C-alpha cells in the first residue's frame, strides 16, 4: 500500500500519494536518514558493549552477555514497535529478527572465514558446546514457526509468549554450567667508680674516695690533685689539690671539683685526678686499683638544630590563626634570629586566601620552641583543597659572650647589653635597620691550638634540621578526553566528518570508569532505544512511500544495519583469538537472544495486554512462516559446510587454504542473496 501509518515519533509526510517524482524525493530523504541512523547506532552500540565489558571484568557466560549487548537494536525495535503502535503485531520487528539471523548466520560467518590470515586456521575446540548452542539457536526460529502455524495457528497465546521468553534464562544457565563443568689484708684506698661523667653546667663534679680493709679504727692521710687531660685548668675546670683525712670508723669521703662554664661549643673532654702520699698517724695503708679517674665533660653549648615538627599539616579552613611550631632540638645557647616566610601554591596568598607574612622570629637563650602565626581566611564557596608552604631561612647567632665573639671571628659592630651570662659581660651584634649612637658600639678588632678552638666552635653554629620546608594543606578529566577525541588520510577525513555529529553527541555519555561501567550502561541503552525508535519510523515510512513491504525492508535494510555491531565483534574474535569458538558463538548467541528476548518479550507484552481485554493476539503466520523455514534449511547447509571444513585438508572452520577459503565465503554470501530474494518474492506472492 501507499498509505503510511503515523509512527512513534515522526509525523506522516503529507499529502500522501503525491506524484512519482515526489516519491523519489521523499524516499531519498527516508533512506539517507535511515542510513545515518544506522551509522549512529553502530557507534553507540560499540560504547554500550564496552560498558558491558567493564561491568563483567572470555567465557561463554561473558560472551553471551556481549552477544546480548550487540542485539539490543533488534531486541528494542521489536518491543518498541509493538508497544508504540498499540500492541498490534507489525511486520517490521519480527522480520528484522528473522532477517538478522540470515545476515548473522551466513554473511557474518562468511566474513569471519575470510578475515583469518592466509595459512592460519581457526578450529572449534569445543564441539560439544557448539552442537548444543547451534541447535538451540536454529530451534529458536523453528519454535517461532510452531506457535504461529502448529499450535493455535495465526494467534499467539499468553503461555506461548512467556515460554518464548523463558527460553532466554535457559541460555543463561547453560552458559554458567558450561564454564564450570563443560569447559573447565691491710687497708687500701680506691675510687667508687673510676670514670665519672658530668655536664658542663653542673658547676661541681662529685667524686668518691673509699677506704676498706685492715682496721677501720685508724686515721688515713691522702692527697689528691687534678692534672690536665684534654681539658685545661683555668679554662675548663678549677684546679684543686686538697687533702683527705679518714676518721676512725669512717670509710668514705666526698670530694668536689669545680667546672668552669661558658657558652663556647666544645667536644667531649676529660682530665686526670691522682692520689698518692698515703700516710697513717701514730704497709698499713696503700693505694690500690683504681687510683686515677677519668672525668668526662659533656658540653651543652650547641646553639640548636632548627626543624619544623612535621612535613605535612592539615588545617581546617575556618580557623582564625595557625600556630606552626619551630623546634630548636639539639641545644640552646644565645639568641638566634631565624627568618621565615610564606610561599603560596594553590592557596594563593595576598590576603584573599591567607595573609602573607614574613619576618625574623628570635629565640632567646635556653628556649627551645617558638610559633609562627599565619592566618588562614575562609571563603563561602566549596572548592578543592588548597596548599601553601612555610619555610625558615638560615639562622643567625645574634648574641654571644665577649671571648666567644673572637672564636667565631665576628667583625661586625657589637653592643654591650646589660645581661650577664655565666659571669661574663654579654654582647649582641648590631643589625642594620637599627641605629646606634655609634659611640656605644665596640667592633672587637695561629698557634695550632687556637685554630682548633675556632674550628670546633664553628660547629656550634645555628643550623637547619631535617624538615626546613613545611607544607600547609587547607581543609574544608576523562570527560574532557572524550570531547577532544570526538573532534580530530583523505579516507579518514571522509569518515571523520561523516560521524563527527555522532561522536560529539555520544561524548555526553558518562565515561565508563564511573559507577564501574553502569553510568555508561544506563545512558547508552537509552540512546539505543531512542535511535531504534527513529529507525522503526524511518524504515516504516520508507517502505510505504515507494510501496515496499515492511517484510522486505526489514530483511534487506534493517537486518543488515542492526547487525553491524555483531559483525565487528565476531571479526575481532576471529582474527585475534586462536580458536573459532568466540567468533562463531557470537553469531549463535545473537541468533538465540533475538528470538527469545526480541520476540519473546514483545509478544509477551502484547499477548498479556490483549488477554486483560479478553481478546486474542493475532499474528499473521504466512509472512513469517516461509522465512523461518527458508532459514533453517539454509542454516543446516551452513552448519554442514562448517563441519566439513574440519577435515585435515582444510583444517578448521575459519581461514584454511585460500582456494577453499573463497568457495566457503562465496557460498555463504550466495545463501544470503538466495534467502533475501526468495523471501522478497514470497512476500509479494510470487511463490
Amino acid at each position, epitope marked *: 500500500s501507499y498509505y503510511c501509518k503515523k509512527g512513534v515519533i515522526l509525523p506522516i509526510w503529507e499529502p500522501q500519494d503525491p506524484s512519482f517524482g515526489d516519491k523519489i524525493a521523499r524516499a531519498t530523504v527516508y533512506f539517507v536518514a535511515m542510513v545515518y541512523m544506522f551509522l549512529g547506532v553502530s557507534i553507540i552500540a560499540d560504547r554500550f558493549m564496552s560498558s558491558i565489558e567493564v561491568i563483567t571484568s572470555e567465557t561463554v557466560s561473558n560472551l553471551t552477555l556481549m552477544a546480548l549487548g550487540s542485539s539490543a537494536p533488534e531486541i528494542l525495535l521489536s518491543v518498541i514497535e509493538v508497544c508504540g503502535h498499540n500492541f498490534t503485531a507489525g511486520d517490521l520487528g519480527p522480520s528484522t529478527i528473522v532477517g538478522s539471523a540470515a545476515f548473522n548466520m551466513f554473511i557474518i560467518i562468511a566474513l569471519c572465514v575470510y578475515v583469518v590470515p592466509d595459512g592460519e586456521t581457526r578450529k572449534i575446540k569445543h564441539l560439544r558446546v557448539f552442537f548444543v548452542t547451534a541447535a538451540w539457536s536454529i530451534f529458536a526460529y523453528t519454535w517461532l514457526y510452531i506457535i504461529l502455524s502448529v499450535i493455535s495457528p495465526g494467534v499467539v497465546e499468553v503461555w506461548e509468549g512467556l515460554l518464548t521468553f523463558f527460553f532466554f534464562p535457559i541460555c543463561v544457565v547453560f552458559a554458567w554450567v558450561a564454564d564450570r563443568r563443560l569447559l573447565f689484708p691491710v687497708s687500701k684506698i680506691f675510687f667508687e667508680q673510676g670514670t665519672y661523667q658530668c655536664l658542663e653546667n653542673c658547676g661541681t663534679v662529685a667524686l668518691t674516695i673509699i677506704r676498706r680493709g685492715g682496721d677501720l679504727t685508724n686515721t688515713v692521710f691522702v692527697d689528691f690533685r687534678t692534672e690536665d687531660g684534654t681539658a685545661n685548668a683555668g679554662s675548663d675546670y678549677e684546679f684543686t689539690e686538697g687533702t683527705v683525712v679518714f676518721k676512725p670508723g669512717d670509710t668514705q669521703k666526698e670530694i668536689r671539683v669545680g667546672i668552669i662554664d661558658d657558652d663556647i661549643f666544645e667536644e667531649d673532654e676529660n682530665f686526670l685526678v691522682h692520689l698518692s702520699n698515703v700516710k697513717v698517724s701514730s704497709t698499713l695503708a696503700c693505694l690500690g686499683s683504681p687510683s686515677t679517674a677519668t672525668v668526662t665533660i659533656f658540653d651543652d653549648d650547641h646553639a640548636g638544630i632548627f626543624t619544623f615538627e612535621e612535613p605535612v599539616t592539615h588545617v581546617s579552613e575556618s580557623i582564625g590563626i595557625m600556630e606552626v611550631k619551630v623546634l630548636r632540638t639539639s641545644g640552646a645557647r644565645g639568641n638566634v634570629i631565624v*627568618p621565615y616566610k610564606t610561599i603560596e601554591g594553590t592557596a594563593r596568598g595576598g590576603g584573599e586566601d591567607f595573609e602573607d607574612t614574613c619576618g625574623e622570629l628570635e629565640f632567646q637563650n635556653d628556649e627551645i620552641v617558638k610559633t609562627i602565626s599565619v592566618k588562614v581566611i575562609d571563603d563561602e564557596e566549596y572548592e578543592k583543597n588548597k596548599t601553601f608552604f612555610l619555610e625558615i631561612g638560615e639562622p643567625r647567632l645574634v648574641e654571644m659572650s665577649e671571648k666567644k665573639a673572637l672564636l667565631l671571628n*665576628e*667583625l661586625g659592630g657589637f653592643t654591650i647589653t646589660g645581661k650577664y651570662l655565666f659571669g661574663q659581660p654579654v654582647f649582641r651584634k648590631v643589625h642594620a635597620r637599627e641605629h646606634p649612637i655609634l659611640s656605644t658600639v665596640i667592633t672587637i678588632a695561629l698557634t695550632s691550638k687556637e685554630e682548633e678552638e675556632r674550628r670546633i666552635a664553628e660547629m656550634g653554629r645555628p643550623i637547619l634540621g631535617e624538615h626546613t620546608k613545611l607544607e600547609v594543606i587547607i581543609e574544608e578529566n576523562s570527560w574532557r578526553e572524550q570531547f577532544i577525541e570526538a573532534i580530530t588520510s583523505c579516507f579518514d577525513y571522509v569518515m571523520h566528518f561523516l560521524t563527527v555529529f555522532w561522536k560529539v553527541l555520544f561524548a555526553f555519555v558518562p565515561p565508563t570508569e564511573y559507577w564501574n561501567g553502569w553510568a555508561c550502561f544506563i545512558v547508552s541503552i537509552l540512546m539505543i532505544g531512542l535511535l531504534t525508535a527513529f529507525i522503526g519510523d524511518l524504515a516504516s515510512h520508507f517502505g510505504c512511500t515507494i510501496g515496499l513491504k515492511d517484510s522486505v525492508t526489514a530483511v534487506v535494510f534493517v537486518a543488515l544495519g542492526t547487525s553491524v555491531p555483531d559483525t565487528f565483534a565476531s571479526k575481532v574474535a576471529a582474527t585475534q583469538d586462536q580458536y573459532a569458538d568466540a567468533s562463531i558463538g557470537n553469531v549463535t548467541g545473537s541468533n538465540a537472544v533475538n528470538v527469545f528476548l526480541g520476540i519473546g518479550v514483545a509478544w509477551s507484552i502484547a499477548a498479556i495486554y490483549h488477554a486483560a481485554n479478553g481478546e486474542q493476539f493475532k499474528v499473521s503466520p504466512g509472512t513469517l512462516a516461509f522465512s523461518v523455514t527458508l532459514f533453517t534449511i539454509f542454516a543446516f547447509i551452513n552448519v554442514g559446510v562448517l563441519l566439513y571444513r574440519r577435515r585435515p585438508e582444510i583444517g578448521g572452520e575459519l581461514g584454511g587454504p585460500r582456494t577453499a577459503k573463497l568457495l566457503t565465503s562465496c557460498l555463504f554470501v550466495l545463501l544470503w542473496l538466495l534467502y533475501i530474494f526468495f523471501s522478497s518474492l514470497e512476500a509479494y506472492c510470487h511463490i
Partner: antibody, heavy 121, light 110 residues
Framework: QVQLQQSGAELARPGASVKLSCKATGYSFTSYWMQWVKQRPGQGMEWIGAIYPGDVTSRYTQKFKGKATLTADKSSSTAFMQLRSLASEDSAVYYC??????????????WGQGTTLTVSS | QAVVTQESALTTSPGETVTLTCRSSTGAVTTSNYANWVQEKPDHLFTGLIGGTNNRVPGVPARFSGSLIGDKAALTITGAQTEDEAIYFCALWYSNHWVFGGGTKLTVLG
C-alpha cells in the same frame, strides 16, 4: 634589575695581599647573603664562603678559613674579599653570587662577571 | 671532602630531550643535599637555574626541570634550543659547605 658589579682585573706578586670588591646594586643589600666562588680551569669550582652584610655573619670552608676574609661595607653597598699570602694556586677567577638565605631557593641567583687574579712574577 | 661527578660532555640536537646527572660520592642524594644547577654562557656569564632540587628561578625558561632519579639528581631540558649550549654545574649542600661538580659541556648542533 639585579646587577652585581665585580671589581676589575688584579695582578699581584706571590706572598702579597689583594682585595676584591663586588659592588652590589639593584636590591636590598643588607637582607641578602653574598657567596664567593673560586673557579680554576680544569679543577671545577670551589665555594669560598658566604657573608651576610646585615650583621656581618660569615661562613667559610675549612681550607679557605685563613686564606680569605669576607667583609662588607653597607654604606657604599659593596662586599669585599681579601686574599692573604697569595701563591700560584690562587691564580683563578673569583665570582660573587647572591643568596636569599633560604635553601629551598637558588643559592646562586645572580653572579658577577668575575675578577681574574694573576699571581706571578 | 666528598666529590661530585658528572659527564665530561654530552651532546644533543635541537628540539630533543636531554637528561643530566649529578652523583654524590657518599651515596644517594636526598632532598637534604639541596642539589642546585647553575649555567655558564661563554665569556663567564653565570646564571642560577634550579634551587632545592625542584624550585626554578623566576625568569629561567620553563623547559628546565630538576628532579631525583635513582641515587642521583637530574636536570632535564625538554626541547632544548641552540641557546642552551652551555656548561652546567651541580652543587650539593652536605650540611656545611657547597660542593660543585665538574660541569657538563652540553653542546647542541647547528
Amino acid at each position: 634589575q639585579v646587577q652585581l658589579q665585580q671589581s676589575g682585573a688584579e695582578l699581584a706578586r706571590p706572598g702579597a695581599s689583594v682585595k676584591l670588591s663586588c659592588k652590589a646594586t639593584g636590591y636590598s643589600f643588607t637582607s641578602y647573603w653574598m657567596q664567593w666562588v673560586k673557579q680554576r680551569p680544569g679543577q671545577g669550582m670551589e665555594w669560598i664562603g658566604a657573608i651576610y652584610p646585615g650583621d656581618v655573619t660569615s661562613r667559610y670552608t675549612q681550607k679557605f678559613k685563613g686564606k680569605a676574609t669576607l667583609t662588607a661595607d653597607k654604606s657604599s653597598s659593596t662586599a669585599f674579599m681579601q686574599l692573604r699570602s697569595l701563591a700560584s694556586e690562587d691564580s683563578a677567577v673569583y665570582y660573587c653570587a647572591r643568596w636569599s638565605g633560604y635553601y629551598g631557593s637558588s643559592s646562586f641567583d645572580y653572579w658577577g662577571q668575575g675578577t681574574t687574579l694573576t699571581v706571578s712574577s | 671532602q666528598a666529590v661530585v661527578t658528572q659527564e665530561s660532555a654530552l651532546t644533543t640536537s635541537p628540539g630533543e630531550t636531554v637528561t643530566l646527572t649529578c652523583r654524590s660520592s657518599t651515596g644517594a642524594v636526598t632532598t637534604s643535599n639541596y642539589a642546585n644547577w647553575v649555567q655558564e654562557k661563554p665569556d663567564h656569564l653565570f646564571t642560577g637555574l634550579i634551587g632545592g632540587t625542584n624550585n626554578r628561578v623566576p625568569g629561567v625558561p620553563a623547559r628546565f626541570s630538576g628532579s631525583l632519579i635513582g641515587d642521583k639528581a637530574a636536570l632535564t631540558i625538554t626541547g632544548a634550543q641552540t641557546e642552551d649550549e652551555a656548561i652546567y654545574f651541580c652543587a650539593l649542600w652536605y650540611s656545611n659547605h657547597w660542593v660543585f661538580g665538574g660541569g657538563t659541556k652540553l653542546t647542541v648542533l647547528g
